[PDB]
Amino acid sequence: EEIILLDYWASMYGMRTRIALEEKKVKYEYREEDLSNKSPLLLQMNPIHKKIPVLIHEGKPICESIIQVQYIDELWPDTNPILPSDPYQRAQARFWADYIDKKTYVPCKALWSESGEKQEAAKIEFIEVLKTLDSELGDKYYFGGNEFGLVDIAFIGFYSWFRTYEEVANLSIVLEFPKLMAWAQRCLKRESVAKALPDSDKVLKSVSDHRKIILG
Amino acid sequence: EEIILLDYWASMYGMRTRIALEEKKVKYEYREEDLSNKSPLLLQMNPIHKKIPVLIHEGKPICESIIQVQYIDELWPDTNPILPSDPYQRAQARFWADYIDKKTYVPCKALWSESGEKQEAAKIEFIEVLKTLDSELGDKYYFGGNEFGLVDIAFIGFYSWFRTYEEVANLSIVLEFPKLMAWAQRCLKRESVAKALPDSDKVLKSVSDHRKIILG
Numbered sequence: 456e457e458i459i460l461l462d463y464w465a466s467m468y469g470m471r472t473r474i475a476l477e478e479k480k481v482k483y484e485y486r487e488e489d490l491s492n493k494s495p496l497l498l499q500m501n502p503i504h505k506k507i508p509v510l511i512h513e514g515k516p517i518c519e520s521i522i523q524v525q526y527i528d529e530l531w532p533d534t535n536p537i538l539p540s541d542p543y544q545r546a547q548a549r550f551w552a553d554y555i556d557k558k559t560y561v562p563c564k565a566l567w568s569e570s571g572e573k574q575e576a577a578k579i580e581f582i583e584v585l586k587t588l589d590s591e592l593g594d595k596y597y598f599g600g601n602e603f604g605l606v607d608i609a610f611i612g613f614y615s616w617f618r619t620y621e622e623v624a625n626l627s628i629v630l631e632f633p634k635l636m637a638w639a640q641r642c643l644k645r646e647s648v649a650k651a652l653p654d655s656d657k658v659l660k661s662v663s664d665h666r667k668i669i670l671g
Numbered sequence: 672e673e674i675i676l677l678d679y680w681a682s683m684y685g686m687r688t689r690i691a692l693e694e695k696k697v698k699y700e701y702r703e704e705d706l707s708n709k710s711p712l713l714l715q716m717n718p719i720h721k722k723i724p725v726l727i728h729e730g731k732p733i734c735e736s737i738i739q740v741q742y743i744d745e746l747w748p749d750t751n752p753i754l755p756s757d758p759y760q761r762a763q764a765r766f767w768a769d770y771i772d773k774k775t776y777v778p779c780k781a782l783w784s785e786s787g788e789k790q791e792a793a794k795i796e797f798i799e800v801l802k803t804l805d806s807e808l809g810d811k812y813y814f815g816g817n818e819f820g821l822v823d824i825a826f827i828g829f830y831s832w833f834r835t836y837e838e839v840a841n842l843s844i845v846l847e848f849p850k851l852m853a854w855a856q857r858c859l860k861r862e863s864v865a866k867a868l869p870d871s872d873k874v875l876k877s878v879s880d881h882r883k884i885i886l887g
């Protein structure tokens with residue numbers, strides 16, 4: 456139970472680790488990091504990347520959200536198992552989490568922080584992700600099949616940003632991807648997800664205010 | 672034993688999967704892909720990224736080299752185990768493999784394919800990787816500690832390119848990082864590594880000829 460999570464409230468990546476901890480019914484200390492004034496603990500525990508989320512367990516750091524989720528799953532594998540038991544299914548889940556990380560590394564920032572050609576580039580990339588994930592989900596209840604799993608955790612945090620993407624990047628998500636909206640609604644019925652995701656209007660307000668200040 | 676590996680002889684990433692298969696004493700079919708004329712099988716099995724290496728097991732694809740290595744380890748966990756048994760050690764091994772992938776994604780190409788400012792940028796990034804990995808290795812025999820492990824597999828393929836990096840990018844590796852040279856020599860004593868890594872002079876000749884043709 457000796458766990459600290461250094462995180463940023465609106466981080467879709469940190470939300471993954473918040474969800475995994477709640478899935479295991481783990482009590483932990485959440486600490487909010489100021490992204491423009493990172494704590495001494497954060498820089499000490501994540502000297503390589505200096506980024507949130509940072510999971511600290513018995514004073515030892517675990518970095519990278521998908522690696523944190525797997526560490527939590529391996530620590531408590533019998534309570535709400537996150538990864539599949541089958542090796543091949545496991546590899547597919549890791550592949551799609553990796554896909555999300557690779558393809559959202561830039562858009563996660565440029566979608567709200569840029570304009571013009573750099574924001575258009577990010578819009579194109581993110582729409583491609585939504586289409587690809589929508590096709591991979593198909594007609595299943597979850598990316599994990601019949602049960603909520605690793606890939607669901609890997610993407611559900613982005614739902615809290617859909618409203619922001621539609622408004623600051625002139626994207627159409629809710630009306631174009633009803634299967635993803637329905638999937639998000641299924642996931643939100645889990646207490647872990649409901650606790651982890653911030654209000655989407657709060658996200659938008661925060662991002663708009665920041666946007667409007669840094670670029671007019 | 673029903674395994675096909677679609678790979679490129681000089682791919683340091685594909686070398687990881689070659690090593691993992693040999694570590695498990697698995698007989699498999701290796702197929703060489705022409706990177707400028709990718710096979711129909713490759714595009715079929717890896718439609719998302721269209722890149723090697725692609726591992727095909729009972730006709731099902733597994734993409735991304737570090738994910739392939741873990742899949743092979745989980746299929747045959749008792750023969751030459753690659754990942755640690757301890758969850759925390761496991762997370763650290765995954766973190767350093769992820770670090771290597773993230774920081775070499777661009778240099779793996781720009782170091783030999785570019786010149787001027789883009790090659791200098793890649794040189795700076797790769798030197799930072801070598802320094803960081805050298806510090807993480809410390810005085811241990813392997814990145815995995817007392818035994819060859821995931822991070823060793825994740826980086827040992829780059830040794831076959833050290834000569835190329837020194838010659839085409841005017842880097843100094845062998846004389847600046849004796850601990851990494853000694854580590855590489857330890858790893859090369861394993862049959863899996865000796866079989867997987869191509870001759871470093873053959874790599875250089877191939878890369879120089881390609882370089883000299885595409886840019887004078």
Ligand SMILES: [Mg+2]
Nearest residue numbers: 538539602604
């Ligand atoms: Mg499951």
Ligand SMILES: [Mg+2]
Nearest residue numbers: 754755818820
């Ligand atoms: Mg080991």
